[PDB]
Nucleic acid binder design. Sequence first.
RNA 1: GAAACAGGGUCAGCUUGCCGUAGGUGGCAUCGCCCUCGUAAAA
Length: 70
Amino acid sequence: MTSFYKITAYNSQALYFWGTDADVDRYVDWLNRDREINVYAAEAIPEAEWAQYEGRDDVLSGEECGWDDF
RNA sequence: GAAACAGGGUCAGCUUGCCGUAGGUGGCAUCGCCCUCGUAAAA
């Protein structure tokens, strides 16, 4: 169920993420700690496209440390 | 080392007596005084 997750907000730097759906939801929450507006939203990247964002260093992973940023 | 948004908006509002009062008073001779004078003018 781990997926490459795109994180978007109106006119905001896209943030690509990899992990579980619960993972991405928690990362969305962390991005939305302060954003009363422009709340980052999670989007599931279609499977075929995954290899593309794969490699891109701008992705957080469902590894242990992918959650120490709090 | 081309193309590239800071953006799409968001009541400072809602409302609040400067008031209740508070002698300018009590009061204090304008005085005490002083010659319009001495004077020249019936052409």
